[PDB]
Write a protein that binds this ligand. Structure first.
Ligand SMILES: C[C@@H](O)[C@H](N)C(=O)O
Length: 329
């Protein structure tokens, strides 16, 4: 089997992407944030504290296929400090025509304020390794892990758009969706992430510096977070750019034409266009724009988030020894 689903930016800035997910019988369609940096499928629900719901909800009591996972609970927090918790059902879940039975659907009893405030995201669908799942006492498998037995190939691909719709595919590689060839690179699962080591970087039309950048491929992170020295080298080539303590990162004049940023994948190179690094105005009508490349020092891990991933066709190879593939597009 295969699946193919359209993923859409939630807003004009590409802050995140949503993908429709069908849960239960009859199907209840929710728009979920597909997150290769976490491993829980959790949803706003009929169980969620009413004052914390503003979203489409899952109602397990309206699904003939929902089963309570007795004694199971979950609780998650993300890098931005957001959180949610609740109880667990198994139910039928379909993405892009690919159906999994018995998927753990984590029903929120409570959600944090950032989730309430974002009307566009009805929950998360985690695609990191199942060792990061937060269900207790027994962790639950991701949608991808549950799908592998039936898939034509144990792979999924992310093709995120720059201010445009894109695609998540499960079970096949669309050879028309990328240019050149895919280069694969080793993954470490020791921390539960799609963690890999980039071979280095270049700024604009300058030299490629060979330097091991260990980081994660994270569709649930908006920006590209890289080592302080690398980020400084980038913004050194932008004459109006400065680090802003109050705004929380590098800012620059919106009128600037930014250099590209290239990262290494083995011998191959992925070029992020300069326009992708212009995240957006700090407020509507500002002359100042926020940078899409920021230091990872405060996070403690380098993150190839949407700014980077949307410049590539990315293959998440979930064979027993996983690998990550990148192609230009
Ligand atoms: C893995 C998930 O729990 C989250 N991204 C974290 O690392 O806190």
């Amino acid at each position: 089997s295969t699946g193919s689903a359209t993923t859409t930016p939630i807003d004009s800035l590409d802050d995140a992407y949503i993908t429709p997910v069908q849960i239960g019988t009859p199907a209840q369609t929710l728009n979920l944030d597909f997150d290769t940096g976490s491993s829980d499928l959790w949803v706003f629900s009929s169980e969620t504290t009413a004052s914390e719901v503003x979203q489409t909800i899952y109602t397990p009591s309206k699904s003939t296929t929902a089963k309570l996972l007795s004694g199971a609970t979950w609780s998650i927090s993300y890098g931005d400090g957001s959180s949610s918790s609740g109880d667990v059902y198994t139910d039928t879940v379909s993405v892009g025509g690919l159906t999994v039975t018995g998927q753990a659907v984590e029903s929120a009893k409570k959600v944090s304020s950032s989730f309430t405030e974002d009307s566009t995201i009805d929950g998360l669908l985690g695609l990191a390794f199942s060792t990061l799942n937060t269900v207790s006492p027994t962790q639950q498998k991701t949608f991808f892990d549950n799908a592998k037995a039936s898939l034509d190939s144990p792979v999924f691909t992310a093709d995120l758009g720059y201010h445009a719709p894109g695609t998540y595919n499960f079970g096949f590689i669309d050879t028309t969706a990328y240019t050149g060839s895919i280069t694969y690179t080793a993954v470490s699962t020791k921390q539960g992430f799609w963690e890999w080591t980039s071979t280095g970087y270049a700024v604009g039309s300058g030299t490629f510096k060979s330097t091991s950048i260990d980081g994660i491929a994270d569709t649930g992170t908006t920006l590209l977070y890289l080592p302080a020295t690398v980020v400084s080298a980038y913004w050194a080539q932008v004459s109006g750019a400065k680090s802003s303590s109050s705004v929380g990162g590098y800012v620059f004049p919106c009128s600037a034409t930014l250099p590209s940023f290239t990262f290494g994948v083995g011998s191959a190179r992925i070029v992020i266009p300069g326009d992708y690094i212009d995240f957006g105005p700090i407020s509507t009508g500002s002359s100042s724009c926020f940078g899409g490349i920021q230091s990872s020092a405060g996070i403690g891990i380098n993150i190839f988030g949407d700014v980077a991933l949307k410049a590539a066709f990315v293959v998440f190879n979930g064979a027993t020894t996983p690998t990550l593939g990148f192609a230009s597009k």
